[PDB]
From a paper:
α-syn is a 140-amino-acid protein mainly expressed in the presynaptic termini of neurons and plays a significant role in the trafficking of synaptic vesicles and the secretion of neurotransmitters. With abnormal conformational changes, α-syn can further self-assemble into β-sheet-rich oligomeric and fibrillar interspaced structures. The transformation and aggregation of α-synuclein are characteristic causes underlying the pathogenesis of Parkinson's disease and other neurodegenerative disorders. Here, we find that a recently established α-syn fibril strain, “B”, markedly prompts the co-aggregation of tau protein in both neuronal cells and in vitro settings.
After helical reconstruction of the main fibril species using Relion 3.1, we obtained a 3D density map of the strain B fibril with an overall resolution of 2.61 Å. The fibril contains two filaments intertwined along a principal helical axis. The helical twist between α-syn subunits is −179.47° and the helical rise is 2.408 Å. From the high-resolution atomic structure model of strain B fibril, we observed the classic Greek key topology within the fibril core. This core comprised residues 37 to 100 of full-length α-synuclein (α-syn) protein, slightly larger than the wild-type (WT) α-syn fibrils (composed of residues 38–97). Notably, unlike the previously determined WT fibrils, the N-terminal and C-terminal regions of strain B fibrils are adsorbed onto and extend the fibril core. Consequently, the structure of strain B reveals the distinct structures of residues 14 to 22 (14GVVAAAEKT22, island 1) at the N-terminus and residues 105 to 115 (105EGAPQEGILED115, island 2) at the C-terminus, contributing to the elongated fibril structure of strain B. Thus, the ordered sequence of strain B fibril that we report includes residues 14 to 22, 37 to 100, and 105 to 115, forming the entire core structure. Compared to other reported polymorphs of α-synuclein fibrils, the structure of strain B possesses a common, conserved β-arch fibril core and has an identical fibril zipper interface formed by residues 50 to 57 (50HGVATVAE57) from the preNAC region. Structural analysis revealed that the C-terminal negatively charged amino acid sequence D105-E115 is involved in fibril core formation, resulting in a significantly negatively charged surface of the protofilament.
Author numbering:
A (entry chain J), B (entry chain H), C (entry chain F), D (entry chain D), E (entry chain B), F (entry chain C), ...: 14 to 22, 37 to 100, 105 to 115
């Protein structure tokens, strides 16, 4: 793996790794408006400076699935009515 | 793995790793408005400076699933009525 | 694993690892408004400077599931009526 | 594991690890308003500077599930009526 | 495990680990307003500077579940009426 | 000056002023080193969250003058010798 | 000056002023080192959350003057010798 | 000056001024080193979140003057010798 | 000046001014090194989030003057010798 | 001046001014090195988020003058010798 060896008989020996890293982030937001309206699904908004490492599995960042329907032998409606 | 060895008979030996890390983050938010309205699902908003490491499983950050329906042998409605 | 060895017969030997870490975060929020209204699901908002490590399981940060319905042999409604 | 050895016959030997850590966080919030209204689900808001390590289980931070319904052989309604 | 050994025949040998730790946090909140209204679920707000380690179980911080309903062979309503 | 008047025959009348004010300050300092060496002058360091108001005089914050020499009818030496 | 008057024949009349004020300050310092060495002058360090008001004079915060020498009809030496 | 008047026969009347003010400041400093060496002058470093108001005088923040020499009818040396 | 008047026989009347103001500042500094060496002058470094108002005088922020010499009827040397 | 008037017999009347103001600033600095060496003059470095208003005088931010010499009826040397 990540090994460092020196055999003396100034000196520098080094091994370094980086996986899933986020450095310096600077952000300014002044006059922001955000509306979210959902009825029967999934919504993901506003994800900033996120890091991850997964070894023996599934890695997911900002993932949205509306719905999972695995039935066996009723429906699944959604109704976003808006009027004026 | 991450090993460091020196054999003397200035010296520097080093091994270093980084997995799932977030450094310096600077954020300013002045006049922000946020509305969230949901009826039958999932919503994730505003995730900042998050880190993770998972070894023998599934890693997920900011994940939204509306609903899971695994029945066996009724429905699942949602109604977001808005009027004026 | 993470090992450090030196054999003498200035010297520096070092091994260091970092997994799931968040460093210096500076945040200013001045005039912020937030509205949340949900009826039958899940909502996650405002997650900042979070770190985790999981070894033999599932790691999840800011995860939302609307509902799980695993029946066997009624419905599940939601009604967000708003008027003016 | 994390081992450090030196064999003498200035010297420095060191091994150090970090898992699930949060460093210096500075936060200012001046004039913030927050409204939360839920009827039949789950809501998580405002999570800051949180760290965790789990070894033989599931680790979750800021997780919301609306409801779990595993029946066997009625419904589950929710009604957020608002008027003006 | 975490071991440190030295064999003499200035010297420094050290091994140190950190799991689930939160360092220096500075927070100022001046004029904050917060409203929470729930009828039949779960709400978690305002979690700051929290650390945990779990070995043979499930670790969860700021987790909300609306309700668990595992019946066997009525309903579960919720009604947040607001008017003006 | 700052006056407020109301003449009735909900009401709000208000006059407010702010001069030399410092609001919410959050600061974290983790591993800081500072060396100061002076021989014949003035040094000012590390001034944070300071406010002042002066009306009929001179206002000064973090002011350094090396020396004032107003003689009338010897010298003024300084010697910062450093060696290795 | 600061006056408030109301003439009735809910009501609110108010006049308020602020001069030289410091609000909420939160500070964390973990591992800090500071060295100061002076021989013949002035040093000011580490001034935090200080307020003042002066009306008919000179206001000064964290002010350093090395020395004042107003003679009339010897010298003023300084010697910071450091060796190794 | 700053006046507010209302003449009734919801209402809001307001006058407000701000002079020399500093709002929310968030700062993180992790591994900082600072060396200062002066022999015969003035040094000012590290000034943060400072406010002032002066009316009939001179206002100065972080001002450095090496020296003032107003003689009338000897010298003023400085010697920063450094060697290796 | 700053006046607000309303004559009733929802209403909002307002007058507001801002002079010399600094709002939300977020700063992160991780691994910073700073060396200062002066012999016979003035040095100003590191000035952040500073505000001022002066009415009948001279306003100066982060001002450096090496020296003032107004003699009347000796010299003023400086010697920064560095060797290796 | 800044006046606001309304004559009733929703309404909004407003007058607002801003002079010498700095809003939201976000800054990250990770690995910065700075050397300053002066012998007989003036140096100003690192000035951030500074505001000022001056009415009947001279306003100056980050101003450097090497030296003022107004004599009347010796010299002023400077010697920055560096060798290797």
């Amino acid at each position: 793996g990540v090994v460092a060896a020196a055999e003396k008989t100034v000196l520098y020996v080094g091994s370094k790794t980086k996986e899933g890293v986020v450095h310096g982030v600077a952000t300014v937001a002044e006059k922001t408006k955000e509306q979210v309206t959902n009825v029967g699904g999934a919504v993901v908004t506003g994800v900033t400076a996120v890091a991850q490492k997964t070894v023996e599995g599934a890695g997911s960042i900002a993932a949205a699935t509306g719905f999972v329907k695995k039935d066996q032998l009723e429906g699944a409606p959604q109704e976003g009515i808006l009027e004026d």
